[PDB]
């Protein structure tokens, strides 16, 4: 019941910041694998009809033998699905999103630093996120394919994510090798703040 | 305290199974970073002089605030140090190690399938290991830089590792990209079974 989404842009649209080969393998190999394995785990359950963002808020009610596979693979599908949409071909937010950033973090610059720190500090595989929690913004990180929508019990953090960065080594190894900070610096050039703004509006 | 060990062979000695560029980055960048961060954590403590494989067996004795840094960083140093030594330039074990493999797994071919399965199913970053536990061989995996020497409470598995394979994406992405199974198949060509036999003798 899940399918791989098409990207909103061509595989080379984000060069030189994110290389075309990475975009192609990340989408057509990594993300495809999560969709396929999530579908396998959903076979013959009552959950095969739920949108993926709703399924991952309900992991405590799936059968115990399928919890891990669904956490990992539905999590992977939800996470990559959002990631493609929040990127696009002095890039900064505006309007009420900028105001909420100023309020929570002091400035856009201070926000970038907190976000990069969270991404750099995540040991092994995972993601860093900007989330809305009780109408306020915060920066959290998760392991592997965990997503703050899963809740504190599972993911260790909570909130509705409106922006995320993938720091699995597959997201940056071909262009940046070990240099995660360089990848994070380039990432700011490709964030679609219009899309993040839309997500913020719908999260409060 | 700790220092980065010299490799027992040139960076290009394992071609074409593992590429020279990866060997260089894996050693001088990734492994160096674990050494540096472990040294920072161990400064001016009674623990700074212990061999690393002894330290990771005693993580319960260290100050509570240093446990996390040492698990990740002394773990990474211990893991990579062993990794370089168990590779060298069809390849299979002999003698009493081969007999032990036959006894525990049925055959060397059956052991390879079990080891590859453990390494394939480790989600995210980690390692797969052949361990000796109560005189018998078994195959286990660990997350991130955990090592079975840390014990079941920390690593979730136990035993003395005699062979391990790194399945962090940095270990294989440049040459294999998403194809972790092709990397594992290549890895059999570079195992130094004489060294593994040595470790088996010491651990039994
Ligand atoms: Mn990814
Ligand atoms: Mn490694």
Swiss-Prot record, chains A, B:
Disulfide bonds: none annotated. Keywords: Manganese, Metal-binding, Oxidoreductase. Mn(2+) binds at residues 26, 80, 166, 170. Its cofactor is Mn(2+). It is an enzyme of class 1 (oxidoreductase). Its EC number is 1.15.1.1. One of its GO terms (biological process) is removal of superoxide radicals. One of its GO terms (cellular component) is cytoplasm. Binds 1 Mn(2+) ion per subunit. It catalyses: 2 superoxide + 2 H(+) = H2O2 + O2. InterPro entries: Mn/Fe_SOD (IPR001189), Mn/Fe_SOD_BS (IPR019833), Mn/Fe_SOD_C (IPR019832), Mn/Fe_SOD_N (IPR019831), Mn/Fe_SOD_N_sf (IPR036324), SOD_C_sf (IPR036314). One of its GO terms (molecular function) is superoxide dismutase activity. Gene3D superfamilies: Fe,Mn superoxide dismutase (SOD) domain (1.10.287.990), Iron/manganese superoxide dismutase, C-terminal domain (3.55.40.20). It holds the Pfam family Sod_Fe_C. Homodimer. Destroys superoxide anion radicals which are normally produced within the cells and which are toxic to biological systems. Belongs to the iron/manganese superoxide dismutase family. This is Superoxide dismutase [Mn]. It comes from Deinococcus radiodurans (strain ATCC 13939 / DSM 20539 / JCM 16871 / CCUG 27074 / LMG 4051 / NBRC 15346 / NCIMB 9279 / VKM B-1422 / R1).
């Amino acid at each position: 019941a899940y399918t791989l989404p098409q990207l909103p842009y061509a595989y080379d649209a984000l060069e030189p910041h994110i290389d075309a080969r990475t975009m192609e393998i990340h989408h057509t190999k990594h993300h495809q694998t999560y969709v396929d394995n999530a579908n396998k785990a959903l076979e013959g359950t009552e959950f095969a009809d739920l949108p993926v963002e709703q399924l991952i808020q309900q992991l405590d009610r799936v059968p115990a033998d399928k919890k891990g596979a669904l956490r990992n693979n539905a999590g992977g599908h939800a996470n990559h699905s959002m990631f493609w949409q929040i990127m696009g071909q002095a890039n900064q937010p505006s309007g009420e999103l900028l105001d909420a950033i100023n309020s929570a973090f002091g400035s856009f610059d201070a926000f970038k630093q907190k976000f990069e720190d969270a991404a750099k500090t995540r040991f092994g595989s995972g993601w860093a996120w900007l989330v809305v929690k009780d109408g306020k913004l915060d920066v959290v990180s998760t392991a592997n394919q965990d997503n703050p929508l899963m809740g504190e019990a599972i993911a260790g953090v909570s909130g509705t994510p409106i922006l995320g960065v993938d720091v699995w080594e597959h997201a940056y190894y071909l262009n940046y090798q070990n240099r995660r900070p360089d990848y994070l610096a380039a990432f700011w050039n490709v964030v679609n703040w219009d899309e993040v703004s839309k997500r913020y509006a719908a999260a409060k």
